[PDB]
Amino acid sequence: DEFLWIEGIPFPTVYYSQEIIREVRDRFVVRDEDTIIVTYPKSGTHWLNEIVCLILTKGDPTWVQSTIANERTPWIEFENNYRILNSKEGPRLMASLLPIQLFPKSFFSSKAKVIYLIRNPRDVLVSGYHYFNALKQGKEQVPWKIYFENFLQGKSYFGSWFEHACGWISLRKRENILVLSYEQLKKDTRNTIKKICEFLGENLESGELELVLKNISFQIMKERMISLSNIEKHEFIMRKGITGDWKNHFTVAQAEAFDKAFQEKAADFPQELF
Numbered sequence: 001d002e003f004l005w006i007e008g009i010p011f012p013t014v015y016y017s018q019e020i021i022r023e024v025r026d027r028f029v030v031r032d033e034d035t036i037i038v039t040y041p042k043s044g045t046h047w048l049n050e051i052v053c054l055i056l057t058k059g060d061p062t063w064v065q066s067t068i069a070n071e072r073t074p075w076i077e078f079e080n081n082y083r084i085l086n087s088k089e090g091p092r093l094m095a096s097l098l099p100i101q102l103f104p105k106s107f108f109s110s111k112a113k114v115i116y117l118i119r120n121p122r123d124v125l126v127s128g129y130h131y132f133n134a135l136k137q138g139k140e141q142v143p144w145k146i147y148f149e150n151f152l153q154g155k156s157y158f159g160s161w162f163e164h165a166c167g168w169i170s171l172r173k174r175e176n177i178l179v180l181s182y183e184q185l186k187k188d189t190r191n192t193i194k195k196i197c198e199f200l201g202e203n204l205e206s207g208e209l210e211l212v213l214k215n216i217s218f219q220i221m222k223e224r225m226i227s228l229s230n231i232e233k234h235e236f237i238m239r240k241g242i243t244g245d246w247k248n249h250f251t252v253a254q255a256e257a258f259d260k261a262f263q264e265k266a267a268d269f270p271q272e273l274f
């Protein structure tokens with residue numbers, strides 16, 4: 001079995017259960033002062049996690065060097081993390097990968113802050129292809145064009161990227177959530193991190209801001225991270241981290257097919273972010 005089907009959504013086989021998903025959706029309370037990072041896989045989740053954690057530490061890498069992403073911002077749906085986050089007081093820093101139909105319903109009646117990271121779905125496809133083939137054995141790997149077809153038909157972890165992205169950015173103009181793109185993070189870096197500083201209320205000044213940028217660059221973040229693969233292919237999430245790698249993978253035919261499927265599965269989607 002490639003996936004575990006929970007609420008009509010394909011999940012990874014390990015780390016997730018239906019009962020937990022249901023509980024998280026129906027009973028986990030999102031408290032007004034909470035702040036949650038919500039992404040789709042291979043959109044730059046580790047990058048944004050590190051962005052936020054370096055903003056909070058004002059550039060001091062020590063925390064992100066000593067810890068992994070799930071220790072800093074525990075994923076709500078991940079494992080039995082909900083027990084921990086329920087049995088914890090104060091303002092909580094959490095993360096998530098679910099589409100809105102599975103996000104905790106309580107959040108829709110609160111001023112909890114949510115940062116939604118989006119990426120060009122083609123680069124998302126490419127990053128996922130490389131990462132999921134990254135450490136499988138040659139015979140058991142997935143050829144490019146069948147992974148491409150599976151992505152276009154929603155046979156991907158946490159369901160269709162189109163449904164996920166559409167449902168999440170349909171709430172964009174709410175005050176308590178803001179969307180931002182991996183491309184924005186890659187080229188309009190300083191403006192973007194200052195905007196998320198505004199949104200999170202975290203005050204940060206000169207020097208510390210230069211520190212954050214330097215520490216969030218791909219190269220030295222990669223050196224940091226290679227310093228632990230119990231639940232991730234630790235060696236393999238830092239691939240090359242540019243924008244537009246899909247042009248090196250998509251044939252013209254595949255690009256036209258992708259644009260077509262994008263235009264009926266996400267007709268109500270403007271690409272101003274990319």
Ligand SMILES: C[C@H](CCC(=O)O)[C@H]1CC[C@H]2[C@@H]3[C@H](O)C[C@@H]4C[C@H](O)CC[C@]4(C)[C@H]3C[C@H](O)[C@]12C
Binds near residue numbers: 045
């Ligand atoms: C196991 C699964 C697929 C890996 C595979 O193809 O074998 C991978 C793909 C997306 C991953 C998740 C994403 O990387 C986001 C989270 C990052 C944290 O560092 C670990 C938990 C975290 C929630 C990851 C858990 C697990 O490693 C995931 C769920």
Ligand SMILES: C[C@H](CCC(=O)O)[C@H]1CC[C@H]2[C@@H]3[C@H](O)C[C@@H]4C[C@H](O)CC[C@]4(C)[C@H]3C[C@H](O)[C@]12C
Binds near residue numbers: 056057063071072088
């Ligand atoms: C994530 C963890 C929560 C464990 C707990 O108390 O339940 C706690 C333990 C120590 C915390 C850190 C320490 O409190 C020191 C830092 C100062 C501020 O509290 C926020 C960032 C700061 C870097 C914290 C980040 C995070 O909240 C930490 C790392």
Ligand SMILES: Nc1ncnc2c1ncn2[C@@H]1O[C@H](COP(=O)(O)O)[C@@H](OP(=O)(O)O)[C@H]1O
Binds near residue numbers: 123127221238
């Ligand atoms: N500091 C960083 N700066 C720029 N891009 C980064 C980055 N860290 C990771 N990326 C890229 O974000 C992708 C993985 O995202 P996620 O955390 O959701 O798995 C990868 O894309 P690529 O495979 O295209 O290189 C990764 O290289």
